[PDB]
């Protein structure tokens, strides 16, 4: 099927390759199989299931709230491209050092990373404002993906360096995202809302932590995983990272806004020390509206 | 110098190319000259001058303020890479459809685009908070660069579509960046500070507007410009876009903070209508502290 040169002859007992002078790019590296039929079949099923969840979340959101729909919007456009051109350039980049780079994956990431991280900075949906910390989250997260993408495109010691630069940026991201979830927990009402925030934290750190692991395991790292193998791994963490997290997000948002509809915006002053941080604790009791220095 | 296959023989009257079976990638497309010695010489001079300005801005900032230093930090690391590996993968990506993509350029852009756009959302340096508009600026700007990068990696009608998707995102970015500059102008004190804001607006829209123009003109578009040609064009708008704009930014910041040191934080309520917008006008007179509905 390929639109690089696939036909060649071996000459001088396979020491010389002869190709048609038809202007096409040529590299043996590009023609290596993407994996077993079983791996491919597994990958095509999880992709349809991802298309189904992407489709239902969008229509569901159809019945503020812009960050969840967008991630599902980008996810549906991703599947139409996968369906028609999954391994066609530039969904996959076939480069001169022999690498296959899944640009489709990294592009989606850079497009939605501000959307997801804005949403991280807006769990309750009540804020109109974003602090200095939000901005450090976006700068560090974009750096991570840019160094990572560079590492995927490189080889040898150059790949090692850019991966390590991605990790330094990534640690800063994880560290600060952890504080946000802590503040969110002590901001939202005491019941079901704190269960959902806790659920979102687990999904976030498991799914986000798995991406550098799948990088090291895939063709971009030690080549342990095949390309279909990598696809399957990515579909699982993709469903968690995007669809499910936005669904939990939308759910949380509904719950918080309904709290304002029933009890109203009753804030508090929980002074945390996880440092000397502060928080406005939404409560269901008008009585409760005081400074609660809960040093962690 | 290249580390893809550069040596080949023509056989059957140039209808067959024979190459050593040494595992190297091969494409005639990759070997096309990058331009004239004159273009190259011009490009190497502007790069050193860019290194010099990057070096002086950094040391100058050495005598809040994080966004300007970072852009100069990234710019210096860019020049050390240019010096050693300007046309080596993945500073340039040589891909299977024959394209040469200057990943070095787009990577820098994605890394600093949040930094610059945060700084756009913080001209005075007094704000601790960022509105919903800032967040739309970051989402739209990153989309622009991602669609653009995809367009550079593609060919034919696929390149046309992604470029057009980049333009749609880009228009949203320009439109909203214009409002920010209008608000900044009516926020800062009446004298020299409004000259600098006006200077920053001109630099911003000229330099940012030139990037899609250089894309259409370069190998990524209609191939009018050569690679050295493109480099020279990029060095000129690079000096404006990064060094000079951050220098004007730092200057503005100093002026505003010195206003608080002399007169103090004396805000107003200029209600704009460029819609029904509002602004806190810093003034040098304690007397002036009222609502001035200046409908534009
Ligand atoms: C043809 O190329 C092949 C490379 O496989 C050569 O075959 C092998 O030769 C080496 C000896 O240097 C042995 O170690 C291997 O056992 C051989 N067989 C295989 C399957 O690898 C062969 O010598 C070459 N012929 C000429 C004329 O150069
Ligand atoms: C060798 O290939 C060349 C291609 O350049 C052929 O030369 C040309 O042949 C065509 C005729 O079909 C003419 O229109 C051109 O004027 C010729 N010269 C050039 C410089 O292009 C040549 O015919 C081929 N020989 C064989 C045996 O196939
Ligand atoms: C913060 C998130 C938590 C989890 C994050 C996991 C950290 C991974 C680090 C491992 C160091 C090992 C070096 C990795 C360097 C990558 C380069 C590489 O794989 O190169 C391929 C090789 O040259 C050809 O086989
Ligand atoms: C908002 C900023 C203001 C200024 C912004 C300028 C707008 C550029 C649009 C031009 C439309 C023309 C179509 C451009 C499509 C690009 C694809 C391309 O160049 O393809 C190469 C071609 O196939 C091989 O020669
Ligand atoms: C876990 C992956 C999803 C379920 C397995 C589907 C699949 O690929 O199974 C085909 C079978 O192994 C025939 O070779
Ligand atoms: C987001 C990332 C998407 C990558 C874009 C994928 C677009 C696939 C285009 C397929 C292509 O290259 O088309 C070849 C042409 O159809 C035959 O001549
Ligand atoms: C330390 C590793 C480098 C991490 C990458 C850079 C950190 C993000 C940044 O630039 O934020 C600084 C800002 O001043 C925060 O208030
Ligand atoms: C923080 C202090 C400034 C140093 C920053 C990064 C060093 C890496 C620079 C990138 C060099 C890549 C060159 C290569 O990989 O060869
Ligand atoms: C404008 C470009 C900078 C000045 C020209 C430098 C340059 O390249 O000039 C070499 C000369 O043309 C010898 O062929
Ligand atoms: C930011 C973007 C930088 C691109 C990274 C450029 C890094 C250049 C590495 C050069 C390379 O590929 O090294 C080949 C090796 O030195 C010979 O075997
Ligand atoms: C319209 C073109 C598409 C522009 C790209 C998307 C706009 C950015 C966005 O998602 O922002 C919406 C947000 O709700 C703003 O308040
Ligand atoms: C807003 C409404 C939703 C449609 C969004 C974008 C359409 C383009 C999708 C990208 C398809 C690329 C496929 C290709 O280029 O082939
Ligand atoms: C599409 C949705 C999500 C949440 C995508 C996330 C991607 C990452 C968290 C990637 C992280 C990387 C790290 C931490 C370091 C190695 C390079 C990566 C870009 C793979
Ligand atoms: C390094 C500093 C700056 C300011 C880089 C800016 C880059 C752009 C403004 C690129 C814009 C593009 C547009 C508007 C549409 C075509 C694709 C581009 C990515 C080239």
Automatic annotation (TrEMBL), chains A, B:
Coiled coil: none annotated. One of its GO terms (biological process) is phototransduction. Keywords: Chromophore, Membrane, Photoreceptor protein, Receptor, Retinal protein, Sensory transduction, Signal, Transmembrane, Transmembrane helix. The chain crosses the membrane at residues 45-63, 160-178. It is found in: Membrane. The keyword Nucleotide-binding does not apply. GO terms for cellular component: membrane. Its main location: membrane. GO terms for molecular function: photoreceptor activity. Disulfide bonds join 25-27. Belongs to the archaeal/bacterial/fungal opsin family. This is Archaeal-type opsin 1. The gene is acop1. The chain holds residues 49 to 245 of 712 of the full protein.
């Amino acid at each position: 099927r390929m639109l690089f040169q696939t036909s060649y002859t071996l000459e001088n007992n396979g020491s010389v390759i002869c190709i048609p002078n038809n202007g096409q790019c040529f590299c043996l590296a590009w023609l290596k199989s993407n994996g077993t039929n079983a791996e491919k079949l597994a990958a095509n099923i999880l992709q349809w299931i991802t298309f189904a969840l992407s489709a239902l979340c969008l229509m569901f959101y159809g019945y503020c709230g812009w960050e969840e729909i967008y991630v599902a919007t980008i996810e549906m456009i991703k599947f139409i491209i996968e369906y028609f051109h999954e391994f066609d350039e530039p969904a996959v980049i076939y480069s001169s050092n022999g690498n296959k780079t899944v640009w489709l994956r990294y592009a989606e990431w850079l497009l939605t990373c501000p959307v997801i991280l804005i949403h991280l900075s807006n769990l309750t949906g009540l804020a109109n404002d974003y602090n200095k910390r939000t901005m450090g989250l976006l700068v560090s997260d974009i750096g991570t993906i840019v160094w990572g993408t560079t590492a995927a495109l490189s080889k040898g010691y150059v790949r090692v360096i850019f991966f390590l630069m991605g990790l330094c940026y990534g640690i800063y991201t994880f560290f600060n995202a952890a504080k946000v979830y802590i503040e969110a927990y002590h901001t939202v009402p005491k019941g079901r809302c704190r269960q959902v925030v806790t659920g979102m934290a687990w999904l976030f750190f498991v799914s986000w932590g798995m991406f550098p692991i799948l990088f090291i395991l895939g063709p971009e790292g030690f080549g342990v995983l095949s390309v279909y193998g990598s696809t399957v791994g990515h579909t699982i963490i993709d469903l968690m990272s995007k669809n499910c997290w936005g669904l939990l997000g939308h759910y949380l948002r509904v719950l918080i806004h309904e709290h304002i509809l029933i009890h109203g915006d009753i804030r508090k002053t929980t002074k945390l020390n996880i440092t000397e941080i502060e928080v406005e604790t939404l409560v269901e009791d008008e009585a409760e509206a005081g400074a609660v220095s809960s040093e962690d």
